[PDB]
Each structure stands twice: as structure tokens, then as C-alpha cells.
């Protein structure tokens, strides 16, 4: 069986305004096999209340998942999504960048 490496985007639901509650997305696509572990992080620590869509695939057969959590950007707090999948020996961590 051939593994497919996930592609990841990390981004807010709305344009970010420090101090305003918003929603942080981690959108994970193009992967195989469907088992995947996705954590969302705030200052390097696991955010405990993370929602995730159910196992789902696109018309090229590859699986995708949208994870999301509440968050309040501030100038100092970091956020990230960390994805662990059999295609990669090490977890992949993608940091949220307010410019993207």
C-alpha cells in the first residue's frame, strides 16, 4: 500500500484581531492511509477542546480532515497544528501565521 503525505493549512476562520475570539482551523488533506492524529497547540501545549470532522475523502481517493478550536490571537501567543501520520516518521508541526 502506498502512503500519501498530508498537506496542512493552518488559518483563522475570520481575519484576526488581537483580543477577539475567533476560530482556528487546521485543514489536513491529500493523505493515505486514513488513520491520522491531529493536535492543535497553543504555546506548544495541547489545546484540549479540539473538534474534528469525520473520516472523508475526495474524488482523487485521498482523505481529508478539518480540525478546529476557539482561540484569541494576541501579539504574543503562538498557535500550531501538529499532525502525526504513518507517511512521516516524525510529526509535522505547522505554525499559525496571521499573514496567511
Amino acid at each position: 500500500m502506498i502512503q500519501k503525505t498530508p498537506q496542512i493549512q493552518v488559518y483563522s476562520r475570520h481575519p484576526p484581531e488581537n483580543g477577539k475570539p475567533n476560530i482556528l482551523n487546521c485543514y489536513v488533506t491529500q493523505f493515505h492511509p486514513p488513520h491520522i492524529e491531529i493536535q492543535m497547540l497553543k504555546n506548544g501545549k495541547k489545546i484540549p477542546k479540539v473538534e474534528m470532522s469525520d473520516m472523508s475523502f475526495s474524488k482523487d481517493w485521498s482523505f481529508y480532515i478539518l480540525a478546529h478550536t476557539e482561540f484569541t490571537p494576541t501579539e504574543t501567543d503562538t498557535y500550531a497544528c501538529r499532525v502525526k501520520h504513518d507517511s512521516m516518521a516524525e510529526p509535522k508541526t505547522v505554525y499559525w501565521d496571521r499573514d496567511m
Binding site: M1, Q7, H32, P33, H35, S56, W61, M100
Partner: protein, 274 residues
């Protein structure tokens, strides 16, 4: 405008961790509207959209029965595949299927299909003529002759031309207000300094539906081919979508560049500049 009803279905084995997981998802155009998940507390087909809450109870009784029979038979297909490929026992494997109909605004069936993948790779597929099969390898050739011999294509065709098309119509009636809305994109440009007297201009489109959209950058009337970064269109999570496109330009020349946004919810494309 064309519309489609499609089902995407996954069976995943997990030897020694109980029986395979099984999922079915139905989409009208690209909106998920029903889902069956074998791992739910009490597995049944469920509405995934408020307009589906209106259907008769018998709808869910028959569809949950179909899903459970597909669940059981997909477990058999996973064992059959292992056998056909002569693969060693004890691994996780997947069988996926997509089946559905695409119908033009004149009600004509434009494409009816039924495709199967094993371990994420094409296995077998009904050709456009809805009568013959394309098998991807020797294992799938066994399936093909078995399906030929059993008249399988005729049953598929009957479904694709009949129930698929008729229910797609029904679902479009039920969900019209939502399915066929447009939310126009809110677009804006951001400016970011990059060492060496360069500036990144990012053209954003947010809050749009449906997902199809095009974003371009122009300098002096021509579109910037390469030099432009473009992210895959992504869900905001509330039913709308986002995308952006950026280019890097000389400090002080920002104002010669324009971003263009094309979307079916706009009466004409948008033009923005920093």
C-alpha cells in the same frame, strides 16, 4: 447549471481491533447531506443538513438498512481483496467506492459512475457507456468477469439513470434555499514588507459560496503567471470558503498591481489595488 448526487464510501480493516470500520457519505453537488458511520453509538444514516430533517421516517429506515447491508458486504470485499492479491494477513487495508450521477440543467444524465479503489488505488470503474468495466490490474479482472457474468453493469445503469437522477431532483427541491445560494467573496489586499526593498501583496477572498473562484494579479494588463503564490481553496468552517493569492513586488511600485476576483456571486469581477 449542472448538479450531482454522489456517495463516497470507505471500509477500513483493523485486524485484531474488532471488525472493519464503515462510512457512507452523501453529497448534493459538494455539500454533505447524509452520513452513516459504523462506529457511532447507534449506527444509522443521519441528516447532515437542516433541510434533510424534513424527510419521512421511512427514508431513514430504508437507507440505514442499505448502509448496514453495505457494511456487511464490504467486510467480505476486504477478505476477497486479500485473497485476490495474495497479501499477507494482519494489515489494515481500505476499500473505497464512489457512485453518483451528474445531471445537466436539461435533466440529461451527463455522467453516471461507479468506481472502486483498493488501498487508495484505482481498482475498477464503470466506463461512460454504463455497460463495460475498466479493471486496473489482474485482481480487478477477476471482479470484472464476475460482474459481467452477473449482469452487474445493468443494475448500476438502472440505478444511475433512474433513482439517482430522480432523488437528486428531490434533494434540490428540499435544499434549494441553501444549496443554490451564492455568497459573494469579501476581498481585500494586505501589504507585507520583505527584506531587500520588496513587498508581498496578498489578495484575499473570504466568506464566499460556492467554492469555485479565481484570483489573479495583473501588472500593466497582463496576469502574473509564475511569481504568484496561490493557496488551495479552504473551508472557513461555517459553510463558506477562503483563498488567497500573493505576488512579490518592488518597494514603491505597489500601486501598479491589481488583484482580480472572479466568482459566480459577483455581477462582475472585482478589481482591488493596494
Amino acid at each position: 447549471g449542472s448538479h450531482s448526487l454522489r456517495y463516497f464510501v470507505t471500509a477500513v480493516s483493523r485486524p485484531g481491533h474488532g471488525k472493519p470500520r464503515y462510512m457512507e457519505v452523501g453529497y448534493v453537488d459538494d455539500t454533505e447531506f447524509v452520513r452513516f458511520d459504523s462506529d457511532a453509538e447507534n449506527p444509522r444514516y443521519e441528516p447532515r443538513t437542516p433541510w434533510m430533517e424534513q424527510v419521512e421516517p421511512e427514508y431513514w429506515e430504508g437507507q440505514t438498512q442499505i448502509a448496514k447491508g453495505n457494511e456487511q458486504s464490504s467486510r467480505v470485499d476486504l477478505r476477497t481483496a486479500l485473497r485476490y492479491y495474495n497479501q499477507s494477513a494482519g494489515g489494515s487495508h481500505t476499500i473505497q467506492r464512489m457512485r453518483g450521477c451528474e445531471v445537466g440543467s436539461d435533466g440529461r444524465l451527463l455522467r453516471g459512475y461507479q468506481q472502486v479503489a483498493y488501498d487508495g488505488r484505482d481498482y475498477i470503474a464503470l466506463n461512460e457507456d454504463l455497460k463495460t468495466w475498466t479493471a486496473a490490474d489482474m485482481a480487478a479482472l477477476i471482479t470484472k468477469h464476475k460482474w459481467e457474468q452477473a449482469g452487474a453493469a445493468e443494475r448500476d445503469r438502472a440505478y444511475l439513470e433512474g433513482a439517482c437522477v430522480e432523488w437528486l431532483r428531490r434533494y434540490l427541491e428540499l435544499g434549494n434555499a441553501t444549496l443554490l445560494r451564492t455568497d459573494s467573496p469579501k476581498a481585500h489586499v494586505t501589504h507585507h514588507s520583505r527584506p531587500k526593498d520588496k513587498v508581498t501583496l496578498r489578495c484575499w477572498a473570504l466568506g464566499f459560496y460556492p467554492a469555485d473562484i479565481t484570483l489573479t494579479w495583473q501588472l500593466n494588463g497582463e496576469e502574473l503567471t509564475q511569481d504568484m503564490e496561490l493557496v488551495e481553496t479552504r473551508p472557513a468552517g461555517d459553510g463558506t470558503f477562503q483563498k488567497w493569492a500573493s505576488v512579490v513586488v518592488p518597494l514603491g511600485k505597489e500601486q501598479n498591481y491589481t488583484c482580480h476576483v472572479y466568482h459566480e456571486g459577483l455581477p462582475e469581477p472585482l478589481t482591488l489595488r493596494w
